[PDB]
Amino acid sequence: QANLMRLKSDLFNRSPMYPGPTKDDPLTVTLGFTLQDIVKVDSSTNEVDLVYYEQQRWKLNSLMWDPNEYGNITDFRTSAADIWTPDITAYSSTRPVQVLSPQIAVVTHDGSVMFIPAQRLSFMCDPTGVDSEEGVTCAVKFGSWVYSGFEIDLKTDTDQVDLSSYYASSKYEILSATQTRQVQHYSCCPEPYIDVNLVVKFRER
Amino acid sequence: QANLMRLKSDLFNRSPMYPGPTKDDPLTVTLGFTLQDIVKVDSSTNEVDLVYYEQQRWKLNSLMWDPNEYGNITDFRTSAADIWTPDITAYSSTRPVQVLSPQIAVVTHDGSVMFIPAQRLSFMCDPTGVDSEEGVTCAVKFGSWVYSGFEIDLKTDTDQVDLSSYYASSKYEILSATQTRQVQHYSCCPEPYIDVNLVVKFRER
Amino acid sequence: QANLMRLKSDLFNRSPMYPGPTKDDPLTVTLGFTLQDIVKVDSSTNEVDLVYYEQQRWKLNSLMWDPNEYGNITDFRTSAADIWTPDITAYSSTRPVQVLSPQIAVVTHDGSVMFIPAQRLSFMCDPTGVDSEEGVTCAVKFGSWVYSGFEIDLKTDTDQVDLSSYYASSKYEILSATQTRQVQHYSCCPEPYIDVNLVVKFRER
Amino acid sequence: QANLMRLKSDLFNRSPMYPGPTKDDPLTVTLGFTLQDIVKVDSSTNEVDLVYYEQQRWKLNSLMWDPNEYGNITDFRTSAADIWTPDITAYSSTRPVQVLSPQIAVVTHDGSVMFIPAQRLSFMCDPTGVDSEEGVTCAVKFGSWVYSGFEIDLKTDTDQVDLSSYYASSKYEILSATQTRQVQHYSCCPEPYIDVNLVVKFRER
Amino acid sequence: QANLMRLKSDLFNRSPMYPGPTKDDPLTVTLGFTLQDIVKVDSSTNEVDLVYYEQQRWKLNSLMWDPNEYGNITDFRTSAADIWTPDITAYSSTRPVQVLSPQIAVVTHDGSVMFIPAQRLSFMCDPTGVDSEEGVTCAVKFGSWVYSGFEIDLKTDTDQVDLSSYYASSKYEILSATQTRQVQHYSCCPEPYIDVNLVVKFRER
Amino acid sequence: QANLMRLKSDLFNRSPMYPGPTKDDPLTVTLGFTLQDIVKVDSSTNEVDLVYYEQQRWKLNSLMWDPNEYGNITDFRTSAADIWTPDITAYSSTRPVQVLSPQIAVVTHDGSVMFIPAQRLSFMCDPTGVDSEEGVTCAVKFGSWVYSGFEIDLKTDTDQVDLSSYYASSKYEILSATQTRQVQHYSCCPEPYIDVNLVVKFRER
Amino acid sequence: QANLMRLKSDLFNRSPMYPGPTKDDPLTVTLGFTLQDIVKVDSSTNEVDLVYYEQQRWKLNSLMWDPNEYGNITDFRTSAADIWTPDITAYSSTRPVQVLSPQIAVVTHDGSVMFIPAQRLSFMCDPTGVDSEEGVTCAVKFGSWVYSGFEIDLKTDTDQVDLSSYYASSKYEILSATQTRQVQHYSCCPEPYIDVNLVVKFRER
Amino acid sequence: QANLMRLKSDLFNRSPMYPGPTKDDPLTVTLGFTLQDIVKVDSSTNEVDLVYYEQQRWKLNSLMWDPNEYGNITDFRTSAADIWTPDITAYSSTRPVQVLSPQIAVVTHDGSVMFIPAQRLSFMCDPTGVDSEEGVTCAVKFGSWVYSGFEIDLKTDTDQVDLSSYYASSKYEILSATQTRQVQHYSCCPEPYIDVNLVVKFRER
Amino acid sequence: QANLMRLKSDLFNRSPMYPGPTKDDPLTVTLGFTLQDIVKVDSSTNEVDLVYYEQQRWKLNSLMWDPNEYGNITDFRTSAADIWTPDITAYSSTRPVQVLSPQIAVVTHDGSVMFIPAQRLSFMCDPTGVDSEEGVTCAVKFGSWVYSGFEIDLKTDTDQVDLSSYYASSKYEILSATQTRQVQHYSCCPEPYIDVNLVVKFRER
Amino acid sequence: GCCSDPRCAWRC
């Protein structure tokens, strides 16, 4: 109980919070999706509702410690509010995201952070042909709202969305789900603009 | 992080917050809209639902710094809550605006602030004729709730709404979309009352 | 900025907040409604939804200042959370009021406060008769939740509701709308109990 | 305003807040209902929505004062967050209660508190037989979530629900509305467990 | 204790410290001396050492209370550090005054303060003649260090120094001791400059 | 450490410092002297220097605890700064008292306090005849500086001074030393004034 | 009163204290002496003791205010600890200076400060020849301890020491007394060093 | 500097200070003396002045740490104000002890503290016969002021006073210097009373 | 003042104070004496009084800054209480050192600190022979009170004491004055122990 | 006079 209290005091009660990255101190955020359910389709509004877990991981020098100094604690859990978190946003939502899980992150002694929020998202999607054998394709991009790729670089560990927990009695079955990093450049500017494209192909069961 | 943390401390922790503009210290707010979707039309209540990004830009002397004194930091990102923000409101909304993006602004060393909230708005609009070739026009004004044009002047940089990321499979096609500064005067009063009128003509795809 | 920062600091940061009115320190609150829309009628539940601005005015000696000590500032805007506000409530709402406007007040140097919340209200209303040419009449009383007429006197400047901004393509036209001060006495007590009855007669189209 | 500011500071800012009752220092809460409207019935879910005022009274030694020491102030109004309030809860609600009134209590110099929240409740109710002349009976129990009868004694002043403000054009007419204190004892345990059972016979008007 | 604690808290903890008198809010200080002993005479340096009690009396509106509001307390003792005290100084001391008594004052409900520091003072005094039957006369002026007579007026209750406590076996006997108000004016200035002149004629006993 | 730390926190850090005695809450100080040494006499200035321990005892309700709640602690020591102490003063010192001991007092569970400061005092005393068999008699009164007999009553256990620790090889032999309560009245004032007269008769050893 | 409390708060409780002068924001300190007494000469140690008032005047922009904004207050008195003061030190003292006056300064609305500490000084001086008609001359330099002439410049308004209050029955008469600004240049140090040389010629009488 | 800063933050800023020992948690203090000089003898007052270092050692569980948790730190130095220190007093001082060195203690990872202040003591000593060949013997007892030997056990490590730094050209030569623990029992009480007796025999030359 | 205010805030109000040196973070302190006067010789106690300036210099990484970031500030003055200072003590003093100059240091942008306290010191010195042509030699050692040579290394820039400011009319003529680093090793221990022996040969006149 | 009086000298 005691070494952890000390570690957290040491990490959190001593300096201002991390102010976020800059181009002189860039950060890499690694994203992945575990798709649980396509819950709803609305063909009068072209909105589709997804339930997934969004895996998010980054690393901060200000969150590192030496485990031998803290009773060999190698990792711990804490409220997401105790730490800086990236501003990763769906770019084509139609409602505010609903959070389904506790807002708790895992911090490792090398400064790595893993935060996995469960979300319900309503996003822009034309479900025409969902009842077909070929099904429909919809796509939503995720990225930072304010940081270019010189401040937050966005990575993934795979382009295959994790379907291992997809609801087997969902009204819709998944034909495919990919998560692909896209890099855009504007003529004005040397810095890249990076997003992760969540592309899902599905039909009525 | 060190230099950025220093800068934030000096800009935000030394003085009290900007109490907003006055007739002696007036401000210009520049507005622009990136219309993403017309999501919903309700012909039984004369409400239409838009999703847009609202670009807001102003400048304060109190947020200037010399980059040399802060490791050549020219700009940074911070929570909208650390700064004063203008009270720009839709005048004929029928529900609370839903915020779809992180409330994070960009501050540049000349004191310029840029804030782009993504919003879903329900507003007063008779959609009768939306289902014809001609379609239907609706309008919604935006402005301050409490400041006259002697305190907050409103400007647009262009009168055309940005349709470059309008949802290509929306149920409604955009025929035109304009964002125009309007000046009202009242007989009583020297001061102008300024608004940006968002006028959208649309029809069913 | 400087004199305004000073004034607000002297007004808000020096004393405890105003504890509200007493029979020894009574207040008059002037109410006025600007009806924008009857948005919705539900004949299954007998609830109707209005959108209006509720103008509220009162005066506190504690908010007075001399403009010559504060660089000739005669008025300012500030967040409604910085000041005491009256507990004016619809006595027959069926849902929590939804706020549609920034919560910001104007204060003038004589201690006068003007606060104008935009609201959507669901209230108790049988709309049977609305499709006819005679239409229907509904009513909702407004007043303090905890203060008698010896503590908060309620008034209107006119018994006529402001319909100058009523949505012109609303599904409901207004036949009339009044706002009238009603005074109740109870046998048991000397003190009046005051409300403002908002009565609206309206019909389709 | 001075004497009231001084009283509130004395009652609220000198001591830890009241930690709630115990067996050693038990408390009586008197409960009464003013039923305003049966708003909605749902025969697909067997949920019914009521609007009512829930009157609560209790008395704390620690809220007593001598009026002669405070300018003969005998009673005042304050936010419900400034004081301890009982955890009176509907045991069969199906949604979170919605608050319709300002959260303000009245405290008297003998330590008596009166708090009357206006609420909308969805609770478990089969409305089969509501169109019939005999109508239908629904009930919901109220009581502490955590305190036994040895810590909070629940009481009513009358078994008759107050119907003097019941909406006359409600879709449902009230046949009977009662409020009955029930004591329950358990096999295992000697503490009495107390609730107040709100029982409403009603039918379609 | 309880009511006295309340009073001191109200008088001291709610407001800024009294900033001292001004020409707009002048004060009168009454001084009186009780001479205990001429302890020491130095004819090599022309210094004489006195031990006396110096009574100081003044009144502040900001120290007033109504005894009925505080359980009939008419007066209390408190640390001299809890209140403003006048800067009364010997104008011809040769060493820092030594304080022989506790620095505690008496406050009365009309805002009256009495403070009686016991002091040992060395001051400028040629004792040439002390060893004669005629004795020798010395004098020391007391007053404010920074306040003119338009800000602090000085008074004595009697021109006769109290000798009822003069040490009967002192090496020096008192032939006379007076304490007299003097007023100076300077040609530049309307304000009077006021002091009390302590004049002591003494000889070897 | 644990039970004691808790006791001191409960006793000292939960309410304001004890405001001293009053006419409605009087206290009795028991005063006693242990004379250690007559250090010197000065026949050119008629001052004599004593070293003694001044025993002081009194009792506060506010300092009582139930030992059963604090692990059977019946007494503790603490800095005299953490408690109210009486303003007992020598009425004819010629220099500030010098403290030779730690300022630490003993508190017992019934609220009794015992404080025994070691002091060196210079006081007014004609040592003429000290070098004879007859010796010399000197006296010094001790009492409160600011409290009358109605707030602080003084008491001795015996009029016989404790000489059992008197320095056997002092320059001065004690012939006798007594300590006597005296009650004084004045025309100014209806209150009794109490002192303890310390009377020492001594010669050169 | 009220306005003075406001001013003191605005001046002192808003920014950090003046950090002292630098080469870019230098200060002029004007210094004058009012010599009251040569108290003592020691021919065994070559130490002389003086009693004087040291008048110090400087000006800070951060101490300015507009009188119209603070009830036409043109000046006020405040504890020396409330403000920055210059570190003017005697360069050939043999004992810590002893302060004889209240540490209170006068601040005027243009930001100028006057501070007049009365002091007893022991400094290095061979008094050989003091018993002759020719008397003796001694000198002591005064200046900043840590700030060079680039940060603090000294000035006198006159080279003549004020002797108008010199003690007329002093053991020592003044033949002359001068106060002369000096500019020293040392071999270590590129920067100029400013002092005021106090030169006193005196003899017995 | 980092590890040491954490250690001191952890030892000093997390918990309240040690409240001193009790009979339940007694403590041993080891005391020794290094005599530097007998500086003065006064045959008119029977006072002798010593200059010595007073070695003090004790051990606190609250001051222990594992060095491996803090970068192998085994010991550090800190201000004696940061820790509890024992109330070790000379019982026959005639003036306040004068402190001649920094007040800084060494802390060791097992919780041991070593504190060695340099002191100048005046104590009661008849110096008759110092000027002979046999010399004179003087003594002063040291001990706690408020703790019995059931709370503070005092001991020495050797009965030899350290003379290795005794001034070789002192006016007084040391014939013997010892430091010996004494135990008293009083008939009334079971607890031992312990002091260390510093005995010095010495003579001129 | 703006830039220096920023500098001091950043240097002092961000991290805990420097904990002093350790063996893993040692520092060098350079000492230099400027001897101003031998004031007094006491052959009855063998004490001599010196007045000198003790220049201390050291360097900390934690006090470094880039001047370009702080308006080219290269150094500044600050209270010695704002920083860590070495515990440099005279080992053979007989009274507390008296400080004659302000406790203010100079910090330079490379982390360098210069602190120069002026001091009156009484120390152990036999002046037998001072009234002869050969005169007399006395010595006093200076070092840290708690730090070994592995923590604080002491050094001088010259073995010649600076006598350029020696008082030319001092009672005592200086014949030589040196300041020499000495290294002691105790047989128990590897670590060195470093002092600066100040050795002065002087005679009358 | 005034410029030697600590209560007045600030006017000089």
XYZ file of C-alpha atoms in Angstrom, chain B residues 18-175:
158
model
C -9.094 38.347 -19.121
C -12.503 39.756 -17.998
C -13.593 39.869 -21.642
C -13.717 42.850 -24.040
C -15.262 46.268 -23.421
C -16.122 49.306 -25.546
C -12.670 50.650 -24.505
C -10.916 47.374 -25.293
C -12.965 45.852 -28.141
C -12.279 42.724 -30.021
C -12.886 41.164 -33.390
C -14.009 37.564 -33.615
C -13.777 35.904 -36.961
C -16.235 33.095 -37.677
C -16.333 30.476 -40.374
C -18.317 27.206 -40.772
C -17.263 23.833 -42.222
C -20.584 22.058 -42.808
C -20.203 18.302 -42.450
C -23.768 17.018 -42.584
C -27.452 17.731 -42.482
C -28.300 14.725 -40.325
C -31.978 15.021 -39.599
C -35.082 16.873 -40.711
C -38.240 16.756 -38.606
C -41.282 18.016 -40.570
C -43.573 17.513 -37.530
C -41.685 20.108 -35.365
C -39.839 22.259 -37.978
C -36.398 21.335 -36.522
C -33.326 20.483 -38.616
C -30.045 19.017 -37.234
C -26.664 20.152 -38.606
C -23.182 18.900 -37.798
C -20.442 21.465 -38.465
C -17.018 22.745 -37.297
C -17.252 26.356 -36.190
C -13.923 28.181 -36.713
C -13.480 30.988 -34.161
C -10.532 33.337 -34.198
C -9.582 36.374 -32.112
C -6.502 38.016 -30.628
C -5.443 39.235 -27.176
C -2.473 41.333 -26.132
C -2.563 39.463 -22.795
C -1.553 36.199 -24.611
C 1.436 37.558 -26.520
C 4.955 36.403 -25.730
C 8.423 36.746 -27.097
C 9.394 33.286 -28.483
C 13.041 33.913 -27.597
C 12.262 33.931 -23.948
C 10.580 30.500 -24.284
C 12.876 28.311 -26.428
C 11.427 29.669 -29.675
C 7.907 28.361 -28.958
C 5.705 30.144 -31.526
C 2.354 28.485 -30.684
C 0.820 25.939 -28.318
C -2.348 24.041 -27.541
C -4.325 24.289 -24.319
C -7.747 23.529 -22.866
C -10.449 26.079 -23.808
C -11.024 26.485 -20.080
C -7.577 28.156 -19.529
C -8.615 31.052 -21.680
C -11.409 33.470 -22.231
C -13.682 32.381 -25.114
C -16.407 34.351 -26.926
C -20.077 33.617 -26.108
C -21.066 32.890 -29.729
C -24.524 31.364 -29.825
C -27.063 30.201 -32.433
C -30.110 32.440 -31.971
C -32.817 29.949 -33.000
C -31.626 26.689 -31.537
C -34.281 24.393 -30.134
C -31.961 22.132 -28.029
C -28.592 22.577 -26.217
C -25.735 22.394 -28.698
C -23.867 19.049 -28.461
C -20.084 19.388 -28.553
C -18.374 16.674 -30.617
C -14.693 17.524 -30.291
C -12.076 18.234 -27.557
C -12.379 21.756 -26.146
C -8.819 22.688 -27.012
C -7.562 25.925 -28.536
C -4.323 26.976 -30.298
C -2.497 30.116 -29.071
C 0.169 31.892 -31.128
C 2.875 34.271 -29.840
C 1.184 37.362 -31.214
C -1.737 36.510 -28.905
C -3.949 35.032 -31.704
C -6.362 32.368 -30.614
C -8.019 29.788 -32.833
C -10.768 27.538 -31.470
C -12.769 25.079 -33.625
C -15.560 23.277 -31.783
C -17.385 20.528 -33.620
C -21.088 20.805 -32.917
C -24.411 19.224 -33.503
C -27.175 21.883 -33.669
C -30.977 21.530 -33.791
C -32.502 24.742 -35.111
C -35.841 26.262 -36.232
C -36.361 25.341 -39.908
C -39.493 24.498 -41.994
C -38.262 21.737 -44.314
C -41.363 21.875 -46.653
C -40.133 21.326 -50.237
C -36.875 19.590 -49.244
C -38.132 16.692 -51.426
C -38.244 18.742 -54.648
C -35.563 19.662 -57.215
C -35.570 23.228 -55.893
C -35.240 22.016 -52.283
C -35.552 24.336 -49.309
C -33.645 27.173 -47.675
C -33.128 27.496 -43.952
C -31.228 30.144 -41.930
C -29.628 30.452 -38.508
C -27.956 33.497 -37.044
C -24.908 33.465 -34.754
C -23.642 36.088 -32.464
C -22.787 37.078 -28.969
C -25.392 36.761 -26.240
C -24.292 39.910 -24.344
C -21.883 42.016 -26.387
C -22.718 44.693 -28.934
C -20.621 45.413 -32.025
C -18.755 48.063 -30.063
C -17.410 45.224 -27.873
C -17.297 42.113 -30.096
C -17.151 42.780 -33.811
C -17.893 39.756 -35.926
C -16.291 39.077 -39.265
C -16.127 36.250 -41.761
C -13.108 35.788 -44.101
C -15.346 34.413 -46.828
C -19.104 34.357 -47.416
C -19.046 30.801 -48.759
C -19.347 27.975 -46.214
C -16.647 25.312 -46.526
C -18.325 22.253 -48.069
C -15.075 20.470 -48.863
C -15.759 17.782 -46.216
C -19.533 17.622 -46.482
C -20.633 14.038 -46.141
C -20.899 12.642 -49.702
C -23.581 10.111 -48.712
C -25.715 12.488 -46.670
C -29.495 12.151 -47.114
C -29.472 15.825 -48.143
C -27.431 17.408 -50.895
C -26.171 20.980 -50.306
C -27.152 23.347 -53.167
